[PDB]
């Protein structure tokens, strides 16, 4: 009922009151965009609370944030976002892969920028590219990714480059399969693209089926 | 990587950060973890240079070599020491950066209304700090651990009419007449 598979988005809750309590106490500097290194190294959160989904900002009883506060955390709650954003702050939800979670906490072991891989596809669906969290790819996704190749037709809109010199099915077995599919599914508009008739029921291919926008 | 205000490269999204130069911060906790970190990098060099001073003649035969195998010391210098310098440098910047702002704040602020009130506007003089720094000044509370000796409560301890005894050897010996203790019921 609450299983955690390999790649589950379970984030430890950093109540906003904690983060707001620190910033006045003086453990955190309000100027420097308070990425999770500061939270870890200032003994705001220990080792035993930063696991792979990095964290989650929760507006717990915080009805107001007084000063312009900048944060680079992972998946703030929608109220916690609209609280920082009212006081002139920011929140660019970084959703780093595990390889990125290390090189952010112990950068004193990485003398030069060792390239960081984009997060799992499940993360890109929900946080990294989703402007609702101001994910750090919500700029790139709309700018560069969401556009297909300048040669792709309708069927090959998802290939890195259109694998044929023509959108249409290539050979007979790619055709008769699509000539039967488009009628197996009653004739829908996009049903031309053959799809597999079996749901793996995997959590990776699961994106928010219903929710806000 | 973050670790300083420059913003981690995760400002791939061109998230700007306006309304700046906005805060004077004394870097209190950061200067603390600097003096803590500066102690480590020196407490690490002390280790990277440990060299046999065998005050005994049993195993004196290594008194010239380092106390760490050449391959290991050649590692520990690079694994833990040179890491601790970066970790020391990081605080040596998160503070040298925050000072730059304070240097700008403490000028544009000194002008407006007073060069006297200025270092009061930027102060943190809580009314009780005399408790922690100069406890001789503090009266408004009784924060001694041996409270029965606070001047407002010294009148608890009894002032025995003592005396010396040269016949006993200069032993001090109280002249209180002991009260006959309770005995039976």
């Amino acid at each position: 009922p609450r299983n955690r598979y390999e790649g589950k988005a379970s984030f430890s809750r950093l109540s906003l009151s904690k983060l707001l309590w620190a910033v006045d106490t003086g453990r955190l500097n309000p100027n420097e965009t308070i990425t999770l290194y500061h939270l870890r190294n200032a003994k705001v959160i220990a080792d035993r609370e930063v696991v792979w989904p990095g964290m989650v900002l929760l507006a717990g009883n915080v009805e107001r944030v007084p000063y312009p506060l900048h944060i680079e955390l992972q998946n703030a709650s929608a109220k916690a976002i609209q609280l920082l954003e009212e006081a002139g702050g920011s929140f660019t939800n970084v959703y780093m892969s595990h390889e990125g979670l290390y090189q952010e906490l112990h950068p004193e072991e990485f003398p030069t920028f060792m390239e960081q891989e984009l997060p799992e596809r499940k993360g890109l669906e929900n946080f990294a590219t989703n402007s609702r969290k101001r994910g750090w790819l919500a700029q790139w996704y709309e700018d560069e990714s969401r556009y297909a190749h300048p040669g792709a037709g309708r069927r090959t809109a998802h290939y890195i480059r259109p694998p044929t010199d023509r959108d249409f099915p290539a050979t007979i077995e790619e055709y008769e399969l699509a000539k039967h599919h488009q009628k197996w599914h009653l004739n829908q508009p996009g049903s031309a693209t053959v799809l597999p008739w079996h749901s793996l029921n995997t959590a990776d291919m699961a994106r928010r089926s219903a929710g806000r926008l | 990587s973050g670790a300083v205000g420059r913003g981690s490269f995760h400002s791939v999204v061109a998230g700007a950060n306006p309304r700046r130069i906005p805060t004077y911060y004394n870097s209190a906790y950061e200067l603390i973890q600097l003096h803590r970190a500066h102690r480590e990098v020196t407490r690490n060099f002390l280790v990277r240079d440990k060299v046999f001073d065998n005050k005994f003649p049993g195993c004196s035969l290594a008194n010239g070599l380092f106390k760490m195998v050449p391959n290991k010391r050649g590692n520990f210098h690079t694994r833990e020491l040179t890491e601790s310098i970066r970790h020391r440098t990081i605080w040596g910047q998160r503070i040298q950066q925050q000072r730059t702002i304070n240097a700008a704040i403490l000028e544009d602020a000194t002008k407006v209304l007073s060069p006297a009130q200025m270092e009061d506007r930027f102060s943190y003089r809580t009314p009780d700090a005399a408790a922690y720094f100069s406890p001789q000044e503090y009266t408004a509370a009784n924060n001694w651990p041996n409270y029965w000796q606070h001047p407002t409560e010294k009148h608890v301890v009894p002032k025995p009419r003592w005396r010396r005894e040269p016949e006993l050897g200069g032993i001090t010996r109280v002249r209180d007449a002991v009260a006959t203790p309770i005995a039976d019921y």
Partner: peptide, 22 residues
């Protein structure tokens, strides 16, 4: 995507172990 804010400040910090003058 270049880094507009604090573009400098990487080359201006941690005068390593301040020398005899300071």
């Amino acid at each position: 995507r270049n880094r507009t804010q604090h573009v400098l400040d990487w080359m201006n910090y941690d005068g390593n172990l301040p020398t005899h003058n300071s």
